[PDB]
């Protein structure tokens, strides 16, 4: 009755996708379920050579997990995002391990399953992380903690304590829901890549006047923020390269276009409009016109040569989980 069960493509994928997953209310303990159910069905189907059925079943299941995740409510986003992503994150290595036991069309199917499952993972992961980090940055008040010069006179201490608790709690859930080590560290790098974007964009849009002192104080707040990550991941600062360079620029004492050219010609961490944006905001407690002028020309030169907009704002972008799913 097995193959006849497996041919009812519709019966059982309806079971998993409406009966089991759309209704997997997390807030509940162990004994990795969805990856077990998904993976049992896929491996039965592959063994019995139903390769097309597997593809369809896996498609519906991914589309389903995707909308579950995308539909999660503001207070469920952390737990839910992590539970689902931790489960999906195992599909690529499952495909790689399936193939270790295999004819040649099956090997090709599984090869494809591995790349395609990885691509869907990368899609859901990125959109979840930005949505997750939008909410967490408001709640933890990253702006007022780091960039708000009005609150430099404050210890900062309560807010920092709240950031450290949040990250300890982010870190527990990651361990709770069993995310693999190499993805745990990636999540923390991307978390910082996200705060690079938000912090740099807010430095430009939200911070009225800037000077060397301002720059020095943000630098310290950043080093405070980064102190949590440090016993945890490889090297956290490259993730925060734009916002770190912007506030370092603010502390340079540059007095001729000749020093400036030495510092920024053929230096691409920030573009010319980003660097100009930062220096037009400079107010003592200023920039030589000669420097303001050369930037203008540089910008104009680049408008004339290339077809694409030279964006001042950043967007969050993360690497593929390709090498991080061990």
Top keywords for this entry?
326 residues; mainly alpha; 15 helices; Myosin-4
Walkthrough of the structure:
With 326 residues, this protein is an all-alpha fold. The protein has one domain (1-326). It is built from 15 helices and no strands. Part of the mRNA localization machinery that restricts accumulation of certain proteins to the bud and in the daughter cell. Recruited to specific mRNAs including the ASH1 mRNA, coding for a repressor of the HO endonuclease, via its interaction with SHE3.
The percentage helix is: 55-70%
* Major sheet summary line: none
Count of the domains: 1
How do the SSEs run, as a string of H and E? HHHHHHHHHHHHHHH
Shape: elongated
Amino-to-carboxy terminus distance: 37 Å
Helix and strand composition category:
mainly alpha
Rg calc: 25 Å
The proportion of strand residues reads: under 5%
Q: How many strand elements?
A: 0
Q: Count of helical segments? A: 15
Please give a quick description of this structure.
Helices cover 69% and strands 0% of the residues. By secondary structure, it is an all-alpha fold.
Which helices and strands, and how do they pair?
Layout: H1 2-7, H2 9-20, H3 33-47, H4 51-71, H5 77-88, H6 91-99, H7 104-140, H8 142-146, H9 157-176, H10 181-206, H11 212-229, H12 241-251, H13 257-264, H14 272-280, H15 289-305
Helix pairs in contact: 2-4, 3-4, 4-7, 5-7, 6-7, 7-10, 10-12, 11-12, 14-15
PDB class: motor protein
Keywords: globular tail, type V myosin, dilute domain, motor protein
Assembly: monomeric
């Amino acid at each position: 009755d097995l193959l006849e069960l497996l041919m009812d493509l519709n019966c059982y994928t309806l079971e998993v996708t409406e009966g089991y997953l759309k209704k997997v209310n997390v807030t509940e303990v162990n004994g990795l379920g969805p990856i077990h159910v998904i993976t049992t069905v896929v491996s039965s189907l592959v063994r019995n050579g139903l390769l097309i059925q597997s593809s369809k079943f896996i498609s519906k299941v991914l589309l389903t997990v995707e909308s579950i995740v995308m539909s999660l409510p503001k207070d469920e986003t952390m737990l839910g995002g992590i539970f689902w992503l931790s489960n999906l994150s195992r599909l690529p290595a499952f495909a790689a391990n399936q193939k270790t036991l295999y004819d040649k069309l099956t090997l090709i199917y599984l090869n494809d399953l591995e790349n395609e499952t990885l691509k869907v993972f990368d899609k859901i992961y990125s959109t979840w992380l930005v949505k997750f980090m939008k909410h967490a940055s408001a709640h933890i008040e990253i702006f007022d903690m780091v960039l708000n010069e009005k609150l430099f006179k404050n210890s900062g201490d309560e807010k920092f304590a709240k950031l450290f608790t949040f990250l300890n709690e982010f870190d527990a859930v990651l361990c709770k829901f069993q995310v693999v080590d190499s993805m745990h560290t990636k999540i923390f790098n991307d978390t910082l890549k996200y705060l690079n974007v938000m912090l740099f964009n807010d430095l430009i849009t939200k911070c009225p006047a800037l000077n060397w002192k301002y720059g020095y104080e943000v630098d310290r707040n950043i080093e405070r923020l980064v102190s949590w990550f440090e016993p945890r991941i490889e090297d956290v600062r490259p993730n925060l390269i734009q916002i770190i360079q912007a506030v370092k620029i603010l502390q340079l004492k540059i007095s001729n276009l000749n020093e400036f050219k030495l510092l920024f010609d053929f230096w691409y961490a920030l573009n010319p409009a980003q660097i100009q944006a930062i220096l037009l905001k400079y107010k003592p407690a200023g920039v030589p016109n000669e420097i303001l002028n050369y930037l203008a020309n540089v910008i104009k030169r680049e408008n004339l040569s290339l077809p694409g907009k030279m964006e001042i704002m950043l967007s969050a972008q993360f690497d593929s989980a390709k090498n991080h799913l061990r």
